[PDB]
Design a protein around this ligand. Structure first.
Ligand code: MG
Length: 334
């Protein structure tokens, strides 16, 4: 089945915006509240769903001649650019469009809105006589040196079930020998999940000792409430994604969709992300440590972000996508 956690926010004043988003609802709530305070006559129908489902649903609904979401917001950058390339989005010519960083804008249609790293997470109580691995080489070595302790107690994204796939496809482009890492994880009996939150809950209470390619923003959110979750930005390289927002062609209320997009692009909206949600901002109007500018300044070539402006060519086609997934299953089982 196709799943969604739906949350409906009535107009503050006493028109409903429909959002399909992969941003976990509790972290989304401050953005929703900010939008609603700015727009007291707008109800918000927020559907929290997997990135692959955002894609599938928009394609299915649009193809069916039906209406679809007014705003699609997804960490599966490739699937968002594909929708936009195949005619499932519509152009949004807005206030901040021309000044939006060029890398973060495909044809005033798909906009990259955040700057979020894929990180290691660890159970702090489990790393008391040795510090956790900080590179992929160290990760593999740790797994080997602690074969029995780690076995079935590490986790990563099930790339078959979209941000996981993105991160793997980027790992393959940096790291020639990513497959040694995948193989090592399979020998350690790696468990795979569709969400960072599932992995974070299990690392938090020590069921798992390590997670790989976890969303750093979510990890920082967890760690702020659960002191036993530690985070390592990998020192060999750190893949960075950006959540992409667009207004579907078949939006019932494209105007409300564009309003929400404008809010997400605004100084106010981007400051809520940076300052409240531990999601680093892309807006050239926002200063501070939780920004793409400062992160690039501090970390440099360690960071491996993904550009939007070249379009679909940056990303793997459907058949190569399928091939990479069967290779990944092949490595985890070898
Ligand atoms: Mg999510």
């Amino acid at each position: 089945p196709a799943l969604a956690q739906v949350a409906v926010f009535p107009a503050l004043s006493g028109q409903t915006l429909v959002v399909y988003s992969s941003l976990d609802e509790p972290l989304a709530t401050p953005m929703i509240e900010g939008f609603q305070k700015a727009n007291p006559d707008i109800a918000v129908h927020y559907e929290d769903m997997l990135t692959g489902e955002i894609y599938d649903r928009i394609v299915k609904e649009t193809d069916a001649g039906k209406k679809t979401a007014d705003f699609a917001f997804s960490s599966a950058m490739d699937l968002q650019v594909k929708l936009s390339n195949d005619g499932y989005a519509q152009r949004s010519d807005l206030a901040m469009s021309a000044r939006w960083p060029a890398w973060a804008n495909w044809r005033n249609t798909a906009y990259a809105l955040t700057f979020e790293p894929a990180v290691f997470v660890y159970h702090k109580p489990s790393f008391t006589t040795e510090k956790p691995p900080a590179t992929r080489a160290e990760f593999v070595d740790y797994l080997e040196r602690h074969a029995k302790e780690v076995h079935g107690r590490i986790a990563t994204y099930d790339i078959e079930r979209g941000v996981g796939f993105l991160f793997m496809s980027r790992d393959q482009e940096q790291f020639g020998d990513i497959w040694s890492v995948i193989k090592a994880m399979g020998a350690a009996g790696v468990k795979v999940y569709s969400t960072s939150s599932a992995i974070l809950e299990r690392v938090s209470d020590g069921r798992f000792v390590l997670g790989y390619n976890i969303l750093g923003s979510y990890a920082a959110d967890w760690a702020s409430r659960h002191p036993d979750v530690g985070i390592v930005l990998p020192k060999d390289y750190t893949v960075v994604m950006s959540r992409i927002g667009l207004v579907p062609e078949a939006a019932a209320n494209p105007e409300l969709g564009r309003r929400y997009l404008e809010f997400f692009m605004s100084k106010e909206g981007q400051t809520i992300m940076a300052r409240q949600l531990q999601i680093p901002a892309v807006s050239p109007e926002v200063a501070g440590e939780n920004t793409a500018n400062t992160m690039q300044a501090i970390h440099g070539a360690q960071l491996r972000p993904v550009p939007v402006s070249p379009g679909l060519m940056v990303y793997l086609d459907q058949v190569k996508r399928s091939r990479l997934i069967e290779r990944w299953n092949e490595a985890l089982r070898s």
